[PDB]
Amino acid sequence: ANLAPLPPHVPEHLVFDFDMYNPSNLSAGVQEAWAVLQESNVPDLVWTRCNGGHWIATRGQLIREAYEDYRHFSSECPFIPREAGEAYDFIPTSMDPPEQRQFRALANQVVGMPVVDKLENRIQELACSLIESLRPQGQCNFTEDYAEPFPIRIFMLLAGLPEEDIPHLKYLTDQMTRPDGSMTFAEAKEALYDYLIPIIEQRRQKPGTDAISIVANGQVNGRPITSDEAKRMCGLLLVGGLDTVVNFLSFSMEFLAKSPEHRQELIERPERIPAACEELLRRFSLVADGRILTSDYEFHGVQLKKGDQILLPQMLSGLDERENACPMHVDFSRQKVSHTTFGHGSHLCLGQHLARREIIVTLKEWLTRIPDFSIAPGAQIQHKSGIVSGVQALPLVWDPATTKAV
Ligand code: HEM
Ligand SMILES: CC1(C)[C@@H]2CC[C@@]1(C)C(=O)C2
Ligand SMILES: [K+]
Incomplete structure (x- = not known):
């Protein structure tokens, strides 16, 4: 690991070198790897020297607070590392x-x-x-x-x-959330834009009913949206469409493949599926972006400097034991599923309704036809970490004789 020189204003006792792109205990699962930040030996707000050096709020309380206070915590540079957050220009994020x-x-x-x-x-x-x-x-x-x-x-x-x-x-979208070193954020972003530009141009000329046409020909501030602004909003739609639910579905199915009673529970009581969806969203939360300090600011006794980046892992809020008892246990009956999986504040996920629909439909339709399945014998499931975490591969096996067509 390449640790960046500790900035003079950061107390050494607040240092905890967590690498958001390659957590130390990744083998135990990605949520578990991130949960190490919530152990008793870790302060509520720490500084990691990894990925250029930045803060990380580890508690749901601080994450929610920072997300609400855009005045001090700006979205202008919401991605770590610095280079990524600066090149990041999606709208409205x-x-x-x-x-x-x-x-x-x-x-x-x-x-x-x-x-x-x-x-x-x-x-x-x-x-x-x-x-x-x-x-x-x-x-x-x-x-x-x-x-x-x-x-x-x-x-x-x-x-x-x-x-x-x-x-x-x-x-390309995956290069922005889970960089493999082949290209910089800017390059993956530019290439994505190269794809969209002619399409937007074309759909501004001859408008359609699709999402790209609606956006490209929309109105903002009483005037027509520009091509550039259209490109920037569409770039975000692409990322959200191709790299969020996609990963989440695999964490959930991985869990279900190992939990026969949880499966059978939704099979008998499909009305519980929406709650199960919420609980899985909490337990298998997977997004982690943040903000940038607009000025010098003392937050919970910690001196943050203007220009300091702070990771506010949406993933951590619901795993925080102060928010949910036995956070690592999946309980579909939890009276209150507290989480910030879809974010918090003014940028709360717009695609969250589409996400829940896709999740709930998947749960019902899969369990209906394939009520009994498991992870392929031998298979070692590996997770990956970044702005959005995921599952490398998920080999499932089942006896066709137990399945049923509808
Ligand atoms: C399980 C699925 C998903 C998760 C966990 C997720 C999570 C998030 C989070 C945490 C934010 C806020 C980021 C911030 O505050 O900086 C966000 C924003 C947003 N999401 Fe989702 N998202 C999901 C699916 C989707 C889908 C399906 C789309 C649709 C293409 C999408 C589009 C958006 C948009 C447009 C915003 C920006 C809203 C704004 O800036 O005002 N997301 N999402
Ligand atoms: C952080 C997000 C999940 C949210 C939608 C896709 C994503 C990576 C963004 O850039 C904003
Ligand atoms: K930026």
């Missing part, structure tokens, strides 16, 4: 209130609740189709066989982009 407001409203028009209600039939259709297709095989590589195609095809459908462009696009 790189803006603080009140600017983000008009732009957030437009994005909502395209991925909001009404749109989800409108596409529910296609969502239901694809889920059933993909699963019925896998059902008689008795095995599947969940990440590539379902986790990826289900949410991504729905997104490409919503955006009016050919499914043929998925491989190319997914490689």
Whole structure:
């Protein structure tokens, strides 16, 4: 690990060199690896010298606070490392209130609740189709066989982009959240923009009903959105569509593959599925971005300097034992599932309704046709960490004789 020189204003007792891109205890699971930050030996707000050096709030209370106080904690540079957060210019995520407001409203028009209600039939259709297709095989590589195609095809459908462009696009979005060293954030971002530019141009000329057309021809601040602003909002839609639900689905199915009574519980009481979805969202939270200090500020006894970056792991809030008792235990009956999995503050996830729909549909439709399954014998499941964490591969196996078509 390459630790950056401790800045003079950071007390040595607050140092804890956690690498968000390669946590030390990753072998135990990614959420577990991040949960080490919540052990008794770690202060509530620490400084890691990894990835250029930055703060990390480890408690739900501080994460919520920082997310609410955009005045001190700006989204202008929300990604670690520094180079990534600076090149990051997505709309509305790189803006603080009140600017983000008009732009957030437009994005909502395209991925909001009404749109989800409108596409529910296609969502239901694809889920059933993909699963019925896998059902008689008795095995599947969940990440590539379902986790990826289900949410991504729905997104490409919503955006009016050919499914043929998925491989190319997914490689680029993944470079921004889980860098493999092949390219800088800026380069992955530019390439993604190169893809969108002609499409936006074209859809501004001849408007459609797809998400890209709606955004490109939308109104913000009483005037027409610019091509640049359109490109920046669409870049974000792509990332959210291709690299969020995709990863989350695999953590959930990995858990279900190892939990027969949890499976059977949803099978008998499908009305519990929405709660189970919420609990899985808490237990398998997977996003971690942050903010930048707009000025010198003392936060909970810690002196933060202007320009200091602070990671505010959305993932940690619900795993915080102060927020949920026995945080690592999955309990579908939890009277209160506290979490910030979809974020907190003015930038609360707009695609959260689409995400829950996809999750709930997956849970019901999978358990219906394939009620009994397990991880392939031998298989060693590996997780990966970054702005969005995921599962490398998820080999599942089952006896076709136990499955049932609908
Ligand atoms: C399990 C799935 C998902 C998770 C965990 C997730 C998480 C998040 C988080 C934590 C934020 C706030 C980031 C910040 O405050 O800087 C966010 C923002 C947002 N999400 Fe999601 N998201 C998910 C799926 C989606 C989907 C399906 C889309 C749709 C393409 C998407 C689009 C958005 C948008 C537009 C914003 C920005 C809102 C704003 O800046 O005002 N997300 N998401
Ligand atoms: C942090 C996010 C999950 C949120 C939607 C996709 C993502 C990586 C962003 O850039 C904003
Ligand atoms: K920036």
